[PDB]
Amino acid sequence: ETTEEFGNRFVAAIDSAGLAILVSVGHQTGLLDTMAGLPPATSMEIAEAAGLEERYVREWLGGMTTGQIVEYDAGSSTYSLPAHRAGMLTRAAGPDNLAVIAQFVSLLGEVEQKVIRCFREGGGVPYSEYPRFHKLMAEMSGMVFDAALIDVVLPLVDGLPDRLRSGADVADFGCGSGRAVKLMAQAFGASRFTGIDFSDEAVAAGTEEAARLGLANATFERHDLAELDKVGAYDVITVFDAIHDQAQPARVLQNIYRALRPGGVLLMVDIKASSQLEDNVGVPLSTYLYTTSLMHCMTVSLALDGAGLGTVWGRQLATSMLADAGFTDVTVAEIESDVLNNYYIARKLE
Amino acid sequence: METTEEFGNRFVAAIDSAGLAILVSVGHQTGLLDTMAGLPPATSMEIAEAAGLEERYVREWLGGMTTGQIVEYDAGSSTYSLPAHRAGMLTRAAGPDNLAVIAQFVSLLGEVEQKVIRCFREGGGVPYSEYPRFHKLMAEMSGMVFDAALIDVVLPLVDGLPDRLRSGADVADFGCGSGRAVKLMAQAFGASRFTGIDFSDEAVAAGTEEAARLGLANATFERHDLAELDKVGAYDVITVFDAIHDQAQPARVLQNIYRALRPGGVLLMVDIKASSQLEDNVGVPLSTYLYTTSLMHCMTVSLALDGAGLGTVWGRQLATSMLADAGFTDVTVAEIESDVLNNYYIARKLEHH
Ligand SMILES: Nc1ncnc2c1ncn2[C@@H]1O[C@H](CSCC[C@H](N)C(=O)O)[C@@H](O)[C@H]1O
Numbered sequence: 001e002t003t004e005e006f007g008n009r010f011v012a013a014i015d016s017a018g019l020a021i022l023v024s025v026g027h028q029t030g031l032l033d034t035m036a037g038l039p040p041a042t043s044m045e046i047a048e049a050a051g052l053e054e055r056y057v058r059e060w061l062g063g064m065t066t067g068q069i070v071e072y073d074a075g076s077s078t079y080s081l082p083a084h085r086a087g088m089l090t091r092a093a094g095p096d097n098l099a100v101i102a103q104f105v106s107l108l109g110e111v112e113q114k115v116i117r118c119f120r121e122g123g124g125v126p127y128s129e130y131p132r133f134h135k136l137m138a139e140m141s142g143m144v145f146d147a148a149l150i151d152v153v154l155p156l157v158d159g160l161p162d163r164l165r166s167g168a169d170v171a172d173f174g175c176g177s178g179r180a181v182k183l184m185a186q187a188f189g190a191s192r193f194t195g196i197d198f199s200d201e202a203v204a205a206g207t208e209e210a211a212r213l214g215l216a217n218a219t220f221e222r223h224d225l226a227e228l229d230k231v232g233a234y235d236v237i238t239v240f241d242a243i244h245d246q247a248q249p250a251r252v253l254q255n256i257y258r259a260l261r262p263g264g265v266l267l268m269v270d271i272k273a274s275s276q277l278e279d280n281v282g283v284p285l286s287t288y289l290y291t292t293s294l295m296h297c298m299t300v301s302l303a304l305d306g307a308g309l310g311t312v313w314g315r316q317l318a319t320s321m322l323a324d325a326g327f328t329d330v331t332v333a334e335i336e337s338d339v340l341n342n343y344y345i346a347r348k349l350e
Numbered sequence: 351m352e353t354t355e356e357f358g359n360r361f362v363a364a365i366d367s368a369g370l371a372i373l374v375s376v377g378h379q380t381g382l383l384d385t386m387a388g389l390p391p392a393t394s395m396e397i398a399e400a401a402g403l404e405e406r407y408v409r410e411w412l413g414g415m416t417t418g419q420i421v422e423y424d425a426g427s428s429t430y431s432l433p434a435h436r437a438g439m440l441t442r443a444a445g446p447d448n449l450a451v452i453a454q455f456v457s458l459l460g461e462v463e464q465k466v467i468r469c470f471r472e473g474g475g476v477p478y479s480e481y482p483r484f485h486k487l488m489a490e491m492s493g494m495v496f497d498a499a500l501i502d503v504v505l506p507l508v509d510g511l512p513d514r515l516r517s518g519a520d521v522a523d524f525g526c527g528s529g530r531a532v533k534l535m536a537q538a539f540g541a542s543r544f545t546g547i548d549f550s551d552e553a554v555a556a557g558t559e560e561a562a563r564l565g566l567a568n569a570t571f572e573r574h575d576l577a578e579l580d581k582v583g584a585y586d587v588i589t590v591f592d593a594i595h596d597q598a599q600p601a602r603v604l605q606n607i608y609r610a611l612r613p614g615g616v617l618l619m620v621d622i623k624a625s626s627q628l629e630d631n632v633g634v635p636l637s638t639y640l641y642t643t644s645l646m647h648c649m650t651v652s653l654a655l656d657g658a659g660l661g662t663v664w665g666r667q668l669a670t671s672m673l674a675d676a677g678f679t680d681v682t683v684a685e686i687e688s689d690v691l692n693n694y695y696i697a698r699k700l701e702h703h
């Protein structure tokens with residue numbers, strides 16, 4: 001490219017950056033929701049529907065309109081959210097709602113300055129500086145869990161579903177807020193599940209939902225995955241997007257191997273990307289992935305003097321690290337439902 | 351006709367793009383972009399050592415920069431380069447031309463999203479006090495622009511203004527802020543007398559110290575609320591830079607500028623280049639960015655004060671109308687081709703008494 005072209009590109013980028021933010025706001029406010037449930041309408045009409053300050057809404061619509069998400073009729077002075085677009089930005093779109101992931105732009109922006117300090121000074125930014133994250137992660141993750149865990153993900157392991165039905169001891173490591181555990185515990189009443197996280201927040205949350213639903217077969221424990229006394233205690237262990245952000249990932253992978261009874265199974269769902277940089281160029285979401293890794297997944301590990309592999313550790317490294325942990329039978333799967341993650345299946349001999 | 355499959359891709363690209371912004375915003379603040387411009391193809395290690403920064407962070411930054419396509423990468427030799435054509439628009443060496451500066455605003459708007467959202471629900475707005483890093487940055491980049499072209503480009507737009515100031519005329523700058531404007535003019539025009547007005551004492555005191563330090567007798571500063579001025583036929587010349595749309599009571603301020611001017615006096619108000627019609631702004635670069643800073647900042651700061659909240663994109667048609675409401679029956683709107691972000695509204699006051 002030449003110079004004129006870059007500026008256009010880079011200017012457009014700034015406009016896109018702003019657009020992202022606007023979408024996140026539309027999500028959190030239910031504007032995007034409200035508009036999907038509406039015909040063409042005026043700023044005041046849309047504000048009234050959403051139960052919001054028209055003024056704020058008016059400017060929102062402006063940005064959305066220039067960014068070509070919303071459509072405004074110059075003649076009638078009404079705005080409209082094209083349906084083909086509303087099914088990609090609304091809660092009702094289930095897993096398809098892309099407005100969720102835009103929330104991360106602001107969340108990452110919140111620590112730009114603390115991050116820049118680590119470029120100069122080393123160390124990293126701890127989890128406690130990202131209070132909003134648990135909720136976003138739960139939501140981002142929750143989309144794929146409700147959509148696909150029980151009927152798509154668990155069936156990737158032959159006979160696992162049957163096994164659960166029969167009864168088995170199952171553990172979710174780095175469980176977060178216990179969503180997957182809650183779904184599985186209702187789904188398989190004869191199996192007993194335990195979820196583990198080092199957060200009080202997550203354990204509280206997962207711990208709570210179960211209290212509410214009376215799911216006896218769900219139980220929650222706070223532990224650090226790098227140090228555990230579980231030996232041969234689980235037939236099945238899952239870990240959903242928790243490995244790359246660990247401080248001592250190889251150790252957790254050893255700790256998983258020990259806690260599995262022989263013939264047991266590890267299902268690690270982690271981000272899909274190459275461990276080689278060149279291979280990620282022009283792939284959608286890579287720039288977003290590296291950003292988050294730098295501003296979150298990469299730094300939170302480093303803050304504990306950890307490994308800091310980041311979000312983009314990749315397939316190659318991830319697999320050979322399962323090899324190193326003792327998993328001699330390892331296969332990688334993917335699903336249409338989740339474009340982001342690989343689904344690594346790893347077995348322990350009997 | 352755009353297809354949903356198609357939108358998804360555009361919006362994912364958008365998602366990628368926001369991250370790319372932040373990376374550049376970081377690269378500039380870190381001094382990384384500046385650093386690479388001065389290097390030959392090098393390794394993540396070499397680049398981090400060259401910049402005096404932590405390699406691991408530099409590496410994550412480099413990766414995104416590579417995927418975003420800004421930075422080029424020879425995987426064969428594990429080296430990166432910043433192409434000269436790109437280095438040009440992201441380096442501090444471009445002074446005012448550095449694009450990288452504006453990227454910093456993604457995080458700055460990021461930092462207030464939660465408070466802004468609350469506003470949708472409860473009204474009011476986010477107070478000016480919560481935006482210190484934002485203010486200091488604007489002022490730093492305007493300041494370069496003033497250094498770059500105020501005397502040789504901006505003032506000459508007002509026909510016969512260089513002479514008026516050369517001979518010596520009574521000048522005021524409203525919303526002077528840091529005061530860079532006042533300094534440059536008072537340097538270039540020893541004959542004229544300048545006054546800087548702002549209501550932030552910090553700024554006022556600051557300027558006064560700067561004035562005295564440089565020994566400029568002609569420069570002066572005062573703390574006033576622009577909306578509460580009682581000045582009457584004090585100034586031959588009044589300059590206002592990008593400080594009207596943010597006001598609580600803009601109409602009043604314009605009415606106060608009319609009143610403070612002498613008959614035969616001139617107002618130069620610099621403000622954002624946009625239409626007041628929404629339709630007109632679609633397809634014009636940066637429209638989205640501006641509507642965003644407005645909702646996210648310029649609009650709310652006013653609303654916080656029960657203000658007008660006209661916003662960053664109040665536009666030309668509304669600005670001109672407002673001037674006339676204020677009393678100016680003679681107004682021309684100038685543009686400079688180089689500057690695409692601002693309109694230079696030149697409003698003249700009638701000579702009779
Ligand atoms: N050292 C550690 N010990 C236990 N949990 C850890 C940990 N380091 C990170 N984690 C967990 O890693 C999780 C990342 S996100 C949570 C994953 C969850 N399956 C979901 O999709 O919501 C965090 O919730 C955190 O609790």
Ligand SMILES: Nc1ncnc2c1ncn2[C@@H]1O[C@H](CSCC[C@H](N)C(=O)O)[C@@H](O)[C@H]1O
Nearest residue numbers: 489492525526527548549550575576591593
């Ligand atoms: N009501 C008011 N009275 C006086 N100054 C005001 C004001 N409202 C806003 N301002 C000024 O608006 C300024 C922000 S913009 C500053 C413009 C400056 N000449 C530049 O181009 O860098 C603040 O410094 C503040 O002093």
